[PDB]
């Protein structure tokens, strides 16, 4: 729950900052270089960046946005490469040989234990 909360929170927060910065362009450029990205398009962009897939179908075009993406590449790659293996390791370790024996009428059984090899 700690790893999931920090991963999801960081991803959604960082997607919101790049959303704001790409939709309101560089001040020096008189805000003319903005890009109309939705919030979900920014969430998808950060996942494609964190995983290092980097399709370049969508990418940050403003200077403030490219700036932020350099710091997100330095922090978010290490976060994804550390957290995703560990969240997958904490899930799905389902014990295959739990459960119990069901006896059937007219058929006996024996229990074998000790040095099972």
């Amino acid at each position: 729950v700690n790893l999931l909360s920090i991963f999801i929170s960081t991803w959604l927060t960082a997607a919101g900052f790049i959303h704001l910065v790409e939709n309101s362009g560089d001040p020096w450029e008189n805000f003319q270089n903005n890009q109309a990205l939705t919030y979900w398009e920014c969430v998808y962009l950060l996942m494609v960046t964190m995983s290092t897939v980097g399709y370049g179908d969508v990418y940050a075009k403003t200077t403030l946005g490219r700036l932020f993406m350099v710091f997100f590449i330095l922090g978010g790659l290490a976060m994804f490469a550390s957290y995703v293996p560990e969240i997958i390791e904490l899930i799905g370790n389902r014990k295959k040989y739990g459960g119990s024996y069901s006896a059937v009428s007219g058929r006996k059984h024996i229990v074998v234990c000790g040095h099972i090899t």
């Binding site: 560089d26 001040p27 020096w28 450029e29 008189n30 700036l67």
Partner: protein, 200 residues
């Protein structure tokens, strides 16, 4: 000693230093971002200017209207061109009004506010042209020129407003000053608290 307040005060020093660093770093970032725009605008001369000829080239360019929410609307408008006198070249140069116009279509002197009707962009260019068509020999404009790079283009307006330039360099400096005040007040609290503790 050590004291209970040390953790909050040392974190306050880390914040004040991060704001000093972020102030200086954002000052350099805005410095390089504004360098080419600020030179390209402030190198332009300011001049007294007078209209000397006007004409349509007998050919049309296309603008794009928007309805709001996902429209293209590509539509023709008349290309009117206007030539103007200036104090540096004293010779024929093409007027483009705002910088954007020049960047989007430098063969015409104007672009109308693009609309769903060809007739409205036609009459808009006629309604604009009949002004500069009569300003022949009128009292001078004040206008902008760039002999080093644009010897045959002339502008009525600046490329940016100085307000957005000023704000981009004000808030880095305020960020740096706030960071310095946080460092000073925190060090003052640490170094004065031990004097009060000895004097108690």
């Amino acid at each position: 000693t050590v004291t209970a307040l040390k953790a909050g005060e040392d974190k306050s020093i880390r914040l004040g230093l991060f704001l000093i660093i972020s102030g200086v770093v954002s000052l350099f970032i805005f410095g390089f971002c504004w360098l080419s725009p600020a030179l390209q605008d402030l190198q332009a001369t300011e001049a007294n200017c007078t209209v000397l000829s006007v004409q349509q080239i007998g050919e049309v360019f296309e603008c794009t209207f928007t309805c709001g929410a996902d429209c293209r609307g590509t539509s023709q408008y008349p290309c009117v061109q206007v030539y103007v006198n200036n104090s540096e070249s004293n010779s024929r140069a093409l007027l483009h009004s705002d910088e954007h116009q020049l960047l989007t279509n430098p063969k015409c002197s104007y672009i109308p506010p693009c609309k769903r009707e060809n007739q409205k962009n036609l009459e808009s260019v006629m309604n604009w042209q009949q002004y500069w068509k009569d300003e022949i020999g009128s009292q001078p404009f004040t206008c902008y020129f760039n002999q080093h790079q644009r010897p045959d283009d002339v502008l009525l307006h600046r490329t940016h407003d100085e307000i957005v330039l000023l704000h981009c360099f004000l808030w880095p400096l305020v960020t740096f000053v706030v960071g310095v005040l946080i460092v000073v007040l925190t060090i003052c609290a640490k170094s004065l608290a031990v004097k009060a503790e000895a004097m108690k």
